[PDB]
Structure formats: structure tokens, C-alpha cells
């Protein structure tokens, strides 16, 4: 009927090559130099005192979509933990995701999850990026998120907006020179309870910007 997991915990597996590289730093975006075969995009997200995601990610040009395909597994989350409890606020902070080479790319954050008492749930991401390139001086994405709904959506949903910039110190580049539109699709198990989520929406590379509704 719904999604196991609060909506939050699955915004940063839901596609950085829509970050806006500032020219000074073209030489060091990863992540369109791929493009279009693509990469590898996978996760170990520890959620501290809870559980863990594992994500495997295939984000690729198909046509003219961005596609972001995902696989989801959820364990040893606790029934009565801020995750599979639903205590989590539905907002979003600002983050800092750390890039450095992979002689790919790596990449690591903590999320800040606001939980209902005022407390927090971290979410520890470990990442990995392998081509299907430039390879980057260490520098960071820093990620703005706002999360809403859809007035006149019936289905579980997400909307959600995004802005990404690289700062802190090769053709596919051209392929985001305008509006792209993105197709994200997420197959999922947590705990056994198996979901799937699709999205669609468009980047704008020229300014960062990320505009997509998921529904489950």
C-alpha cells in the first residue's frame, strides 16, 4: 500500500550528475565524463544504532533520459527504531558530499535525519562510482533538498527539489547542455517488506537544479 520507510531515508539513493560544476572545476566532474554509458553507482548507508541500506545503482543516458536504476537492501533495522518506526521528520538539511579519486570516484557524507523527539539519526554513506573519464582532485558537492507532496496526487508520493554544486579546493559533458529529462526506478527489500519506487522529473545542469515526483 505504502512504503516501508519513511520517505527521507531514500532521497540520497533516488543522480549527481546533475551537479553544476563551476568552470574552474570542469576538469574534475566524474560524473558526466561517463556519460553515456554511464556508471556504477553503490552505497553502504549506515544507519547508526539501526540498519543499513546497500544500493547498487545503474544511472545511464538511455535516448535522451537520464535513467537511474536501483536495487534496495534493507537489513537489521529495528522494528522499534526511528526507520521502520516512522519517526522521522520530512525535511531535508543541507549536506556536503566529499569526493575523492579512485585509481572512479568515492565519496563520503553523513546525513543528519531530524527525528520526532528533536533528536538525530545519522546516515552514514559510504560511495563508490565506477565507469561503464576524469578522474577528480578531492573537492565536494554541496546539496540543498527540499521534500513536498502533490496536492492532487492520490498515490504515496514524494516531490522533491534539488540544488548541487561542486566547490572546495570529458565529452558526455556536452549531452547536459539543456534541460535532461530523468527516469529513476527503485526496486526494494527492507527488513523482507519487498517495494519499488518510480520517479520522473528533469536536471538542469546549468544550475543544479533536480525536480522529481517518486511514487511507491
Not at 560524473?31 to 553503490?42: D, I, N
Not at 522499534?80 to 520530512?90: A, P, Q, S, V
Not at 548541487?164 to 527516469?183: D, K, N, R
Request: hydrophobic letters at 35%.
Amino acid at each position: 500500500g505504502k512504503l516501508p520507510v519513511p520517505w527521507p531515508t531514500l532521497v540520497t539513493t533516488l543522480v549527481q550528475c546533475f551537479s553544476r560544476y563551476p568552470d574552474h572545476m570542469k576538469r574534475h566532474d566524474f560524473f558526466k565524463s561517463a556519460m553515456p554509458e554511464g556508471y556504477v553507482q553503490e552505497r553502504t548507508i549506515s544507519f547508526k544504532d539501526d540498519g543499513k541500506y546497500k544500493t547498487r545503482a545503474v544511472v545511464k543516458f538511455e535516448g535522451d533520459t537520464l535513467v537511474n536504476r536501483i536495487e534496495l537492501k534493507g537489513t537489521d533495522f529495528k522494528e522499534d527504531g526511528n526507520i521502520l518506526g516512522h519517526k522521522l521528520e520530512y525535511n531535508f538539511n543541507s549536506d556536503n558530499v566529499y569526493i575523492t579519486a579512485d585509481n572512479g570516484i568515492k565519496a563520503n557524507f553523513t546525513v543528519r535525519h531530524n527525528v520526532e523527539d528533536g533528536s538525530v539519526q545519522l546516515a552514514d554513506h559510504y560511495q563508490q562510482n565506477t565507469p561503464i573519464v576524469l578522474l577528480p582532485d578531492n573537492h565536494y558537492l554541496s546539496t540543498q533538498t527540499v521534500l513536498s507532496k502533490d496536492p492532487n496526487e492520490k498515490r504515496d508520493h514524494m516531490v522533491l527539489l534539488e540544488f548541487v554544486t561542486a566547490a572546495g579546493i570529458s565529452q558526455g559533458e556536452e549531452l547536459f547542455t539543456g534541460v535532461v529529462p530523468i527516469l529513476v526506478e527503485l526496486d526494494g527489500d527492507v527488513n523482507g517488506h519487498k517495494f519499488s519506487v518510480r520517479g520522473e522529473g528533469e536536471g538542469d545542469a546549468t544550475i543544479g537544479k533536480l525536480t522529481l515526483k517518486f511514487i511507491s
